[PDB]
Design a protein around this ligand. Sequence first.
Ligand SMILES: [Mg+2]
Ligand SMILES: [Zn+2]
Lengths: 294, 242, 286, 166, 150, 131, 154, 110
Amino acid sequence: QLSPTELTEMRNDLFNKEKARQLSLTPRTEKIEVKHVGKTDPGTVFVMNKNISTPYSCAMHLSEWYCRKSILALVDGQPWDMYKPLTKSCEIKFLTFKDCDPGEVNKAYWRSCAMMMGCVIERAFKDEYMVNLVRAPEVPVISGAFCYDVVLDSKLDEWMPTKENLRSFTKDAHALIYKDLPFETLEVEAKVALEIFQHSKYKVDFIEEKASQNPERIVKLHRIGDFIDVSEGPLIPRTSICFQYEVSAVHNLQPTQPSLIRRFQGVSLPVHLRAHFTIWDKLLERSRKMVTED
Amino acid sequence: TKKRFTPPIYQPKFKTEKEFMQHARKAGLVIPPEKSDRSIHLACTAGIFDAYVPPEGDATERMKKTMASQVSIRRIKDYDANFKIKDFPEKAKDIFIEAHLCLNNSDHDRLHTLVTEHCFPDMTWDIKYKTVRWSFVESLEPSHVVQVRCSSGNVYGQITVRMHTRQTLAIYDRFGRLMYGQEDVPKDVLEYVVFEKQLTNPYGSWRMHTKIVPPWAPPKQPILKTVMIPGPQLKPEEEYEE
Amino acid sequence: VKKGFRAAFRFQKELERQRLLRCPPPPVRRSEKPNWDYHAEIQAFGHRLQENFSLDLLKTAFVNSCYIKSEEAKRQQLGIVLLNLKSNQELSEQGTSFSQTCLTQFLEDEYPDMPTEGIKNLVDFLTGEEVVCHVARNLAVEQLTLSEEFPVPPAVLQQTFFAVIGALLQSSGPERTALFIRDFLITQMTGKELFEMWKIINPMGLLVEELKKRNVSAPESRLTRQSGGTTALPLYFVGLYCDKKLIAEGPGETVLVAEEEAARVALRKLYGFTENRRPWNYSKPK
Amino acid sequence: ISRKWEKKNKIVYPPQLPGEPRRPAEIYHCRRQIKYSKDKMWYLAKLIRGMSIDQALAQLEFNDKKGAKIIKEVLLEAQDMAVRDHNVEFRSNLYIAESTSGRGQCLKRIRYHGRGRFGIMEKVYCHYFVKLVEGPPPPPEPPKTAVAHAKEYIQQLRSRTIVHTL
Amino acid sequence: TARGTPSRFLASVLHNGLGRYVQQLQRLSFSVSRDGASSRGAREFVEREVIDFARRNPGVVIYVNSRPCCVPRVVAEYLNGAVREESIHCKSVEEISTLVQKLADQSGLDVIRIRKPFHTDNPSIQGQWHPFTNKPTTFRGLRPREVQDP
Amino acid sequence: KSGTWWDEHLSEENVPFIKQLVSDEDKAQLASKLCPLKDEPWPIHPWEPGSFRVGLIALKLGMMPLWTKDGQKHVVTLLQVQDCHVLKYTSKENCNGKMATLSVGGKTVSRFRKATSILEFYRELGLPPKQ
Amino acid sequence: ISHGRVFRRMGLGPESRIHLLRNLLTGLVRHERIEAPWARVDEMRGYAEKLIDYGKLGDTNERAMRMADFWLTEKDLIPKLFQVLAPRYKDQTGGYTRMLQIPNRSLDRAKMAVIEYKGNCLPPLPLPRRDSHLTLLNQLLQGLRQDLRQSQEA
Amino acid sequence: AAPKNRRTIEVNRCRRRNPQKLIKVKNNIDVCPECGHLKQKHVLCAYCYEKVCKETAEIRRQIGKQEGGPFKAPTIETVVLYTGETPSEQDQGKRIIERDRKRPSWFTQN
Ligand SMILES: [Mg+2]
Ligand SMILES: [Zn+2]
C-alpha cells in the first residue's frame, strides 16, 4: 500500500494533470465581456479572457481595495470563488464581510477554516496511526464553532487530547496562515474525482452523494498547497484572511461501538473583523461545547 | 549671462478652430487674413473619389460598372503610354511587400516613395515605440485590378487591387513583451489595397493610398491582455441611470 | 569664449574616457583589434615557452570543430575552394591521455602512501575545467584559440590546452613534454591542502578503513585541551589515540568539528601529504 | 535646463526571447515649475517612495499640504498613461519606485526692511519626478535579528589574520 | 597616498620562476611618425636598436606602425592581459632603450602599493603558535580548582 | 494594518450585552475573594520587633475639618480604599534586595483598554485589572 | 496653568466670544444646519441645547423672552423657537442637536464640523452606521447570548 | 546673536530627515460603502456629504422664493416634496417646498 508521505504525491499529479487538461480545452484566446453591477463603479465592463481570467483579476483593474476586501464574487446571483476562472460572459458583483447580509461570505469562511484544520490533522499524529478524514459538517455560524469529523486508529480509541496537544494544533494552523497559501478550486467530473480519493473509503461515499445531486455530476475540488480535499460550496481565496484561529476541543460521536468518530471543533475570526482578547475568550468557551447540526 | 526663464506648459484647452477664433474675439486678439501667392502642394489626395464596396460572399447593372472603369484607364494612358493592366497587380505585390518590410527596420526615408502622405501616418504613428516583425509567407490567389477610376489643377488615378495571401505578424511592446500576434503561424488575409499616382507630376509614381474595410469582414484576432472599460464618472449631485 | 585648441582637445579625451566608464564596450577577440599577425603570434608562443613546436601541428591545435562548422555557414550564405582544415579532437585525446598518465606517475611516485581514489581526484583537479582554463588565459592560449563564440567557453578552452600538449608530444616526445606538465600543471597545488583539492565526506569513517588495512586498532577520541565551554566562543582540541598513542590532534569550535579535523589530520599523515612534507623537486633531472 | 526625464519613456528594448522572464514596465513622468518649495515637497515624495499606486493616492488624499494635491494629480495621469501607452494590463499593479524633487527656475523680488535696508526674496519653484514600475511593492527588509548580528561578529573573528608578519 | 590608493600583496603570474621562467611581455606596439621632431628619438631606435632587441626577445611580437602623429607611444601587452601605454615623446634613444627593456622585465601586475615585501604559501614548518603551544598538560585534564571523582 | 477598539465591529444590539456581560463578571470576581481565611490562607505569624507589614492604595476624596476635645481645629484628608487586593509576592532571594516585596493594586479599571500581557496576569489571578 | 477651565478663549475677548457664538446660533435657528470650525461649534452646541429649554418655558415667561431677544439677533426667529422648535422636542428632554466632523476646508485646512437640529426638513446627512448584526462576529455573539439567556431561565 | 560657524549638509540632513520631521502614515482610511470613495473612520465622506449640500442648497433657494424677503420666517413646520408626491397624512398645515426633480433614493420620506 502507498505510504502517507507518497500518497499525496500522486494526488497532486492527478490534480495538476486535470488542471492542465481543462486549460488546453480552451481556445488560444477567447474574450468575454463581464459587466459590473454594484453600488460602486456602476457600468464598468471587463473584457477578460475565457477560462483564464478570474474575479480577482477583474478587481485588479479597479483598485487594490476591492482585492483586499473582496472575499467572494457573486456571478449571476451565484457565489464564485475569487480565483475561479470565468467560463462565459456574465454579470459580476463583489462581496465583503462588512455588508448588510453577508450570509454567503460567512458560510465560505466557515467552510475554509474547517478545511484548514483537516490539513493539520493529517500531520500531527504519527505515521503509524491511520487518520482517515470523513467530512466537514455544514453547521451554521451562530452555533459558535466549526467542526470536521475524523477517525483514528484502533490504538487511539480512548486517547483524549490534552491542553498541550490542542495548542500544538493551533501552532500548525497559524504556521499554515503564515505561508499565505491560496485556495485553488477545480470542478471535475465525479468519475475523475473517485480516482484521486480511491484509496480513502469515506471520501468515495461523500463524492457519490454529490454526483447524485447534480445532473452534470461534477464535484468541486479544493487544495491548500499539497493537501487536497473535497468540499461543498465556494471558499475564500487565501489562508492569510484568518487572523485568529484555535481548535477548542474534541468530542466523540455516538454510537462508539460500531465505529469511533471524533469531532475536532474550532473557531476563528478574519482580519477584517478582529475581536478583543476579552471577547475572544468568551467565544472560545462556547466553542469548546459540543455542537450538533440541525 | 545665459539666462532664460520659462513658464510651465499651458496646454491650450479648445482645439477646434472656431472656438479659437470665437475666443480670440473675446480677448481682442485680431488676426488679419494672410496674403501670399505661394500655396502648399499635395502629392496625394485626401480620400477616395468613388467608394468601392466589395460584393458579399467574395471571401446588366453589374456589367456597366466594369465598363466605367475601362474608360478611366484611357485617362491613365494619356499621361503614360507604356502602361499595361496585366502587370500592375504583379507590381502591386512588390510595393505591398516592400512597404511592410520598411516597418521592421524603420526605413521611413524609403517608405515615403512607396506610400502616400495620407497613408504614412496610419502605419507609423501607432508603432513609433513598438517592434514589428512582419513577413510574407505565401500567396494564395493572384491579384486582380477590381476597379480603376480617376479624378474629374491636378489629376490623380486610383487603382483598387484585391489581395488574398498568408501573412505572419508579431507585434512587441516597448519592453520586448509580446503584444499582438504569433510569429510562428501565418493566417489568411483578404484586404483590398488602394493605390494612387499623381499623373500630372512628371516624377509621380504608384503608391499605396489606403485599405478598404468591408462591413462583412470577420473579426480581427483578439489581443493578449485584458481591458477595463470604465463607466460614467458621475458627480455627487448627479445620480446614476440605467 | 577663450581662444586655444590644446585644452579643448585634451578635454574631449577626458570626456571619451568618462563615456567609456559609464558605458563600457563589449569585449572582442584580440585578432579583430589592430596590430595582429596570426603567424607571428603563434611562433612566439613556442619560443616564449622554449619549445621546438611544429607549426603545422600547432596551428591545428587551436582549430576547433565549432569554428569549422560556423566558418562553413558564412560561406553558404555568400555562396562561396573547399577547406581541408582539421580539428583538434585527435590531438586533444592524445594530450588528455598522456597528461592523465604522466600526472599519475608524478604523483604516484611522490606520495606512494596515497590510495588510487585520492590520486585520481588530484588528477581530476589539476586537469580540471577551472585550473586548465586559468593556465590557458595566462599563456596566450585564448588569443590564438579559433572558436565560434567569444569569450571562449571553458570546455572549448580546456579541450584546446590539451591539444597543445599533443602537438608537443609528437614534436619533442614524452620526456620533453612531461616537463611542460610539471612546470605549469604540477605548480597549481603548491599552497593548497589535500582535502581542498580532493573533497571528501565523513573523514572519520575513512580513517577507520585505512587503519584496518594496516591492522591497527580503532582510534579513540579524547579531549586534550578545553576553554570557554559555556561561552559562545569555545576552543576544543580532540586527540585520536590508537593503543594509547597520539596519532592526530585537531582544533575546533565544537567537539564534533574538532573530532572531524583530527581525522583529517591523521589522513594527511597516513598519506604523507602534510604541510611539513618536503617541497616538490623542480631541479633539472640528473 | 535639462529634460532627460521625458526621454526615458522613448527607449525601445529589443524583443525578449521565449525563455527570458517577463520584463516589468517602467513609466517615467514629471511636472515642471511647481510653485512650491523643493524642501517641503521632499517630505511628500519621501512618504510614498516604495508605496503602491493605490496606497500613495490614499495618503496624499488626506494630507493638508499643497504639494499633496499636486503629486496626486501627477500620479493619476501617470497611471492612465501607463495602461494607455505603455501596455500595462492592471492599473493597480504599480508601485512607486522613485519619487524626488528638484529645484526649478526661481524668480527674485525685493523685500523692504527698516532704516532704508532691503532684502532679496526669491519666488521659489520646484519639479516633481516619479517612476512607476509594474508589479507589487517589493517586500520591506526585515530588521536585523540577533542571529545575524552574532553570525556577522563570528565572521569578523574568523577573518582576522596575523598582521605585520609573514 | 596609501589610503588614497589601492593595494595588493606580492605575487607572481602562474608561479613564475618555480619550474621555468616565462617572459610575461607578449607584445610591443610602436607608433612613430615619418615626419615630426617629437618622434626623432623613436625613428633612430627603429633603425639600429629594435632589430637587435627582437633577436634577444623572440617571444615578444613587435609592431611598428609608421603614421602621422604628434605624440609617439609604445603599448605593452602582457600574458595576464594587462596593458600599459607609455609615451616616448621627445626622448633620446638611450632613454627609449632603457624604457623598452623595463617593460620586458615587468610582469604586468598593477604598479601599486605592495603590503609586504615577501610572500610565502607555507609560512610555518613546526606549527603556527596557539595559546596551548607552550602550556603543560595536567593529570586527567582537570581545570583549576575542579573536584574530581565527587 | 489598522488598529481597532473593542466596539468597532459590534452592532447596536451587542454593545449593551457585552457591557453588562463583562460588568457582571467583575462583580462575581470581586465577590469571590471576600473569604480569604477559608480559601487555604498562608500561615499567620504574630508580630515581632523589626517587622514590616504591607500597606494600602487609597483614593483621595477631599478634605474635612476636625476638632479635638481641647478646642483646637485640625484639617484631615479623606482616603477611600476601593478594590484593593494583593497581586503577587516575591521572596527575599528572588527580590535581589534585603526585604521581600508584596504587590498591591487598586481601583478596578476596564479590560478593553489594557495590554494583552497585563490582561493574562489578571486572568489567572481571578481579579479585574487595577489602575 | 489651566485646570478646570471649561470655556475657550476665542474672538477678541469675553464679550466678542459671546457675539461670535450668537451669530452661529442665530444662523442655526434660521437654517437648522450650518458648517463652521469644530471648536466654535463644540463651544456653541451647549448654548443651542439650553436655548430649547427656555423655549419650553413658554413665551409668557419674561425671563425666557429676554434670553431669546438677546441670543436671536433676527427677531422673526423668536416665534419659531417658541412655536416650532420647542414643540418639536416636547417629548425629548435632551440631545436636541448632533455635531459631526467633516473634511477640513481648503482655504486654511481648519478642522470643521456640521451641526444641526434633530428633526429638520433637510436631506439626511450621511450618518455613520454600525456594522450589521448579520456579520460573523455579531452572529457568534448573538449565539453566545441565547445560551447565557437560556441557561439563566433553566 | 549670530551663527559662529556654517552648518554642514551632513548636520542638516540629520535634523531635516529626523523621523519626527517626516510625515506619519495614516491607518484610519477606509472606503465609503455607498459611493466606494475613500474616507476617514471619524470623518464624513466628502463625496456623499457634497451631494447633500447641492440638494440642500437647491431647497434653500426655493424657500427664498416663497419667503420673498428678509425677516419672513414661518411659525410652522416645513416639508419638501418632489415630482410624484402629495401632502402626507402627517404633512398637513405645513410649508411644502415643491422640487422639480425625482426624489433622491438616499433621501427617505418621513
Ligand atoms: Mg523710508
Ligand atoms: Zn461616500
